[PDB]
Ligand binder design. Structure first.
Ligand SMILES: CCC(=O)NCCCC[C@H](N)C(=O)OP(=O)(O)OC[C@H]1O[C@@H](n2cnc3c(N)ncnc32)[C@H](O)[C@@H]1O
Ligand SMILES: CCC(=O)NCCCC[C@H](N)C(=O)OP(=O)(O)OC[C@H]1O[C@@H](n2cnc3c(N)ncnc32)[C@H](O)[C@@H]1O
Ligand SMILES: [Mg+2]
Ligand SMILES: [Mg+2]
Lengths: 263, 263
């Protein structure tokens, strides 16, 4: 008897990429399930005995080393930010991204992006640090999505930026290229001062990158050239580990390093 | 002319511990301010030229290494959790901690603690990992406080726990002792199965620790012995760097590694 769709969904939860297992084979569900449970338990046992690191934490540490070694200051700014920051980012209540904001009190929200806080750091550090000013942050961001296969409501962004000298399109592309080649992730940069560039892996957007200046800058007290880009860590993990579903790369109680925890 | 209280507040923002500067000295405000601005800019310049690491990120990486090296699995679980988890933690709407929860939708909240998610991981991993099960998480937690000098609304917790064999009071105390002596933080353990222990630095609570089992366990499908403790990273930093105000240790736009960013 062929497998049901429910049975197949269950096995797919337990399936890891390159299991090299045959589903249309003849063996009963009970046996296919038991084999996969056995392998996934062995996977968790191996992690526990050997490395013990979470993929998302580990990627964050690897990205952090990359940017610190190339002259970028590590920032840790608030996750809960004023709603006023969202309007000052030019996100009107009429816009689609405005519908995606998780509001917290009358006055606050979960940040949907790193830009507002990094803008403020750029302005502030310009009074203390020599040109060029190079900073980055990694951390949680939040957007209400009709999520599915490549959007999470709770995700993790990297944003880096440089302000002052050396803020060219060529340098932005070179940093992106060095970064992704260091992680071992395949990509192409797609796009036409004011440039928006998308870093794609096939149809999947890994990053939006910007070559400033842009008019928004003056709302944040910024009047120098700048370059920057934002990457989703879960997307990077999804590509790197060949997960079919981005939920396998998320902060989660249902997956650990892409392995089902419902065993 | 003596300094005003406002002037003194301003200088205190710029003052770092062991500046060895004399305020009741005779020199005008303008000059004292200029000296401190100069030193704080030099501090940021030194960080930028040399290490480039944020203290909170760096402490997290150091704590992570400590626990991974001693057999604990690194967890990264959701920050946004179901409100049902809070009631199942035995936090009634009549309780004070219930007033402190940041609600997000009808159904979700920002986690005020790590326990509910770690409970779920303990139950799940018990089907896969050999006894004893040893896990930890580090990350953001949220409580509405009348904050002041030692509470933040947005803070960072470490929680570790062990379940199964070896779950004794002596072992819990030994792990706490090794951890704090590794960080170089002075402490005493204060307290009388079911034990609550507070780890104190003078009057400042660094941790609450628990020797299970306790009755709550069965709401989470846990029926084995366990031990665990939760530490605030910002409190640890405050003690370690001798900050007078915990805001200097927080995720912030006003302080970087305890140095004012308003220069
Ligand atoms: C100082 C300002 C600065 O430095 N600006 C430069 C940053 C420009 C860009 C600016 N940072 C920007 O916001 O784009 P995005 O909303 O498309 O998000 C960027 C990336 O986040 C990931 N991402 C976005 N939403 C999600 C989601 N719901 N789930 C998972 N990953 C996501 C995804 O990888 C996407 O490509
Ligand atoms: C599986 C369950 C488990 O493993 N349980 C063991 C954990 C027991 C204990 C359990 N984890 C517990 O919740 O106590 P707390 O609310 O007093 O918070 C603990 C610590 O967080 C810090 N802390 C708490 N609130 C704040 C704040 N508003 N600002 C800064 N630091 C804070 C502070 O260091 C405090 O000592
Ligand atoms: Mg985009
Ligand atoms: Mg307490």
């Amino acid at each position: 008897p062929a497998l049901t769709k429910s049975q197949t969904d269950r096995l797919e939860v337990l399936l890891n990429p390159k299991d090299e297992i045959s589903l249309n084979s003849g063996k009963p569900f009970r046996e296919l399930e038991s084999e996969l449970l056995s392998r996934r338990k062995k996977d968790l046992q191996q992690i526990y005995a050997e490395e013990r690191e979470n993929y998302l934490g580990k990627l964050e540490r690897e990205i952090t080393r990359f940017f610190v070694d190339r002259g970028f200051l590590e920032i840790k700014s608030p996750i809960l930010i004023p709603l006023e920051y969202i309007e000052r980012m030019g996100i009107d209540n009429d816009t689609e991204l405005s519908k995606q904001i998780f509001r917290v009190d009358k006055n606050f929200c979960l940040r949907p992006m790193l830009a507002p806080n990094l803008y403020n750091y750029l302005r502030k550090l310009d009074r203390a640090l020599p040109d060029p000013i190079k900073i980055f942050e990694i951390g949680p961001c939040y957007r209400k999505e009709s999520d599915g296969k490549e959007h999470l409501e709770e995700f993790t962004m990297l944003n880096f930026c440089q302000m002052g000298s050396g803020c060219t399109r060529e340098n932005l592309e070179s940093i992106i290229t060095d970064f992704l080649n260091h992680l071992g992730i395949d990509f192409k940069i797609v796009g036409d001062y004011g440039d928006t560039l998308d870093v794609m892996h096939g149809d999947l957007e890994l990053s939006s990158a910007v070559v400033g200046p842009i008019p928004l800058d003056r709302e944040w007290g910024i009047d120098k050239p700048w370059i920057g880009a934002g990457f989703g860590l879960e997307r990077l993990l999804k590509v790197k580990h060949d997960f079919k579903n981005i939920k396998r790369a998320a902060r989660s109680e249902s997956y650990y390093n892409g392995i089902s925890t419902n065993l």
